[PDB]
């Protein structure tokens, strides 16, 4: 059953398998808690604030994390609607400048120091280039804490060359999801912005010459932006240039 | 049984079921290269060369695609191990600029006049709030042209406010495959980089003083990066603000 639902390699009970319950009704004990998940397979950690009515549950896999999650938003328990949703992952860390030699297992094997990893990744292109930028996931927050200390106090190497990593706690964003219409509180600036649907402008009209000028601010953005990262580049590539000078004679035993 | 990999509310035969196979070998046929997944359920779209030993084929869930890939992906097939990789998003395009009051649904509803779509997300950050981007997909790739050509080149609006969509090809990150050790080439920098292991560098030796100096880099392109973000909102703060001047005055049909 449940466990053909696992992707390929999944660990079981991980961050990414925790789902967040609101709106749960006053009386609600940790057993009820578990009978609303007893469909979706054995629970994980469990934690419920019946005072604020709200709980957490961890539950096997991925997928059965988003069916319990589809099948239980937005349904009635003793008079309130339950809300439903994926936890925040505060035990995920964002790390930057990698070197391009840096691979999945690699930073897995640095990062373990700190604690056991869930999924430790390094972002590639769709060139299948490296971005030097990775994500690593701890299985607990204490683990992620300690590595995002470290790393930002210390100089955390992973290479031969001494290029830092730079760590900071994951800002994930949502692109599954998303930001559905139900979701949208309906206020009166709402109902200003969908006065008009979606449409072209025509040059000449009120709407067209704004909107060319807000196009022009985004492009002017781009061009500024690009600037500081070439100026980024060029002096990364003279303090490589520089560190590479100085190597060749520090392993001549003259450094 | 294979329908259980669908994901809660999932089409079938997406972009994203699409694989692409290397390495086959000269002798290949369509239909021998459907055999080779012909345990993955019905298949989908499917092309091949034979010249150049490559094809694609769809598959009917995302779930369904990733088993294969993990299946398929390096095993021997007549003297050659395929390559079987998730294909490039061709079909996909990003969009910005979009005001906070775009839904998933109000996005999918404007895209959808230049053809039928896939998938149409606002990409929400950690709190929940819009980020300003989204993703559309086209199920043909003419249909995701014509709406990059359509919005480029005129004025496409989502909401009453005149601010124009910024339409691009996705170019889409891998945070899920990430760059695996055996794909990363063992040339000659490749050795030098592994030479040292993960560590931590102690203030006073080599390493750190340009380990503290790349660090000091990466903060001076953030602290610019901002800037140039902040002086983007002040601009569109200041355009926005001349506009509900003038949209007061064209409603009271004095302009």
Redesign the interface.
């Known amino acids: 059953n449940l466990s053909?639902?696992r992707?390929?390699?999944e660990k079981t009970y991980t961050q990414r398998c925790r789902l967040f319950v609101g709106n749960l009704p006053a009386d609600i004990t940790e057993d009820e808690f578990k009978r609303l998940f007893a469909k979706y397979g054995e629970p994980g950690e469990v934690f419920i604030n019946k005072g604020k009515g709200f709980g957490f549950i961890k539950l096997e896999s991925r997928?059965l994390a988003?069916?319990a999650k589809?099948?239980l938003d937005d349904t009635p328990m003793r008079g309130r609607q339950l809300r439903v949703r994926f936890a925040?992952?505060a035990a995920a860390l964002s790390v930057?400048?990698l070197?391009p030699?840096?691979?999945?297992?690699?930073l897995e094997?640095?990062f373990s120091?700190f604690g056991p990893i869930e999924r430790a990744?390094?972002?590639?292109?769709?060139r299948?280039r490296?971005?030097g930028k990775?994500?690593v996931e701890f299985a607990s927050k204490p683990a992620a804490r300690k590595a995002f200390e470290?790393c930002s106090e210390?100089?955390?190497?992973?290479?031969?060359?001494?290029?830092?990593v730079?760590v900071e706690p994951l800002?994930?964003?949502?692109?599954?999801?998303?930001?559905?219409?139900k979701?949208?509180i309906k206020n009166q600036?709402?109902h200003?912005?969908?006065?008009?649907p979606?449409?072209?402008?025509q040059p000449g009209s009120?709407?067209?010459e704004?909107?060319?000028?807000?196009?022009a601010?985004?492009e002017?953005?781009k061009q500024?932006?690009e600037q500081?990262?070439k100026?980024?580049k060029d002096?990364?590539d003279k303090?490589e240039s520089?560190?590479e000078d100085?190597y060749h004679e520090?392993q001549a035993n003259l450094?």
């Open positions: 053909l639902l992707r390929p390699g997928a988003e069916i589809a099948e925040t992952h930057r400048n070197s030699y840096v691979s999945n297992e690699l094997e640095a120091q990744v390094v972002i590639v292109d769709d299948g490296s971005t990775g994500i470290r210390g100089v955390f190497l992973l290479t031969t060359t001494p290029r830092p730079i800002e994930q964003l949502d692109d599954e999801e998303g930001l559905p219409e979701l949208v600036q709402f200003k912005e969908r006065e008009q979606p449409r072209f402008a009120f709407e067209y704004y909107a060319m000028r807000w196009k601010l985004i002017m953005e500024q932006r500081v990262e100026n980024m002096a990364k303090l520089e560190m100085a520090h450094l």
